[PDB]
Symmetry: C2
Subunit: 278 residues, 2 copies
């Protein structure tokens, strides 16, 4: 009824060891992951009815993922269990200067076309770029994207475009663009921006409002707040730079559907409690 999130669900194998390469990482902790999935969990914790549309294998990890999905009261009807493929897994290093991530994609990219009914019942629809990168799941994703629009739903897209995830032949950038243009809100980060628009802009990136982007776009600047704009005006949230966690922010922003005004961008901000309470 509230939000429908479509994209990848996977387990993250993280290694905090400070090494040169991931080939040097020896210790790994298994985490629940997948941005669309983290957003779902959060929205649920913020007490909203969410439905995550993903594909995971029928194995230890898939089961593990489902368990936390069920324990978080995330509606899991649109979740698909691949009877033959493995649950997607990404290996990560995590550090100020040194990630390196290795993707072992499988199930996540084999998402089928089943519950488009979930949309209508919802009313925010959120989509990620990751899910778009690979051939089979990509199609069911945009098909769902366009359906959500047809149904007059609020469409949120995260233009986290990164070429490596894409086949040598496909465009990639145009696909991400073909969608930014048809979306309501987007959350590019400076990196997500450099990757799609090159360095040609330090904040003018937001000129992507002309990138068809329509709606409005909030550009996160990591350790310096955000810059939103609906085209009529540009806003830098914390005016004081001294006064990352996009899935939390996005969740808060999405949740800003309880009230109104894209001031929800601030509400989301307070939601980025990297921090620790719980």
């Amino acid at each position: 009824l509230d939000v429908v999130s479509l994209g990848e669900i996977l387990v993250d194998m993280i290694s905090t060891e400070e090494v040169n390469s991931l080939s040097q990482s020896r210790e790994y902790t298994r985490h629940f992951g997948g941005s669309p999935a983290n957003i779902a969990v959060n929205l649920s914790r913020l007490g909203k009815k969410v439905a995550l549309i993903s594909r995971l294998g029928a194995d230890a990890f898939g089961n593990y993922l489902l368990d936390v999905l069920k324990g978080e009261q995330i509606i899991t009807d649109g979740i698909q269990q691949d009877k033959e493929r493995r649950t997607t897994i990404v290996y990560v290093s995590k550090s100020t200067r040194t990630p390196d991530w290795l993707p072992y994609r499988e199930a996540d990219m084999y998402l089928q076309e089943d519950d488009i009914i979930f949309e209508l019942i919802k009313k925010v629809f959120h989509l990620s770029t990751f899910i778009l990168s690979r051939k089979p799941a990509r199609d069911t994703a945009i098909k769902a994207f366009n359906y959500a629009r047809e149904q007059g739903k609020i469409v949120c897209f995260d233009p986290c475009y990164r070429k490596v995830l894409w086949p040598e032949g496909d465009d990639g950038a145009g696909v991400v663009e073909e969608i930014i243009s048809r979306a309501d809100f987007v959350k590019p980060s400076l990196d997500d921006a450099r990757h799609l628009f090159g360095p040609d802009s330090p904040e003018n990136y937001v000129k992507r409002y002309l990138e068809l982007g329509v709606k409005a776009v909030i550009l996160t600047l990591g350790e310096e707040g955000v810059i939103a704009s609906d085209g009529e005006e540009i806003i830098r949230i914390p005016a004081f730079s001294e006064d990352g966690a996009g899935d939390a922010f996005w969740s808060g922003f999405i949740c800003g559907l309880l009230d109104g005004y894209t001031v929800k961008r601030s509400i989301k901000l307070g939601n980025g409690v990297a921090a620790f309470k719980i």
Copy 2:
């Protein structure tokens, strides 16, 4: 020049946590794995010229594997770097009284046909069953198997047959058998035996000498020594049960090429250095 080992090379993600399922394992340590690979490393440490024939991806793990392969002075000419597939990875528990492993095979099963020259230069050739389970690599493995025989090389096969690793249609057992019959030595374990011959035998399993097995076969009984036989006679190594690590044992046994007599089965025995003695 000494030994040519052909089979899988992969990284093992182990979790010692005592849990019911692997879906409960949260901590994983990254290890260098692959039986044919462990045998190579050992032979190398026992100071013999070995060449491991395997296929790993062109990524963190593949690189990691190579580094230890190079640091162990293992000849790596026949090693293939898959430019597109991921390095195979197996998840393991060791846990409870409820063990479990999850294979993420990729590169390892895509071994090609390149250095058959390695054999001639070698003179023991060792093969595993794992590598035979899946369709592409399986072919280059037996082709190498038959070549090694044609060249009059000593052929060592580990009949670690386990159905799950095999496609629903393929025979599996007959393939493993078709090879046991053409090999010189084999190292089945009681489990490897129960899996291929059912329980129909507690030690009579060794009747597999008639299983075409030819040469001789040493049957490891885990915590009770081994039972070898060339058909003319059956021997139980430690006569006293109170007086697992097959890759070490096998290495030792293989290394028993410095001297003679299959008494090398004893030399190998001393070679398993779990954490006891030494």
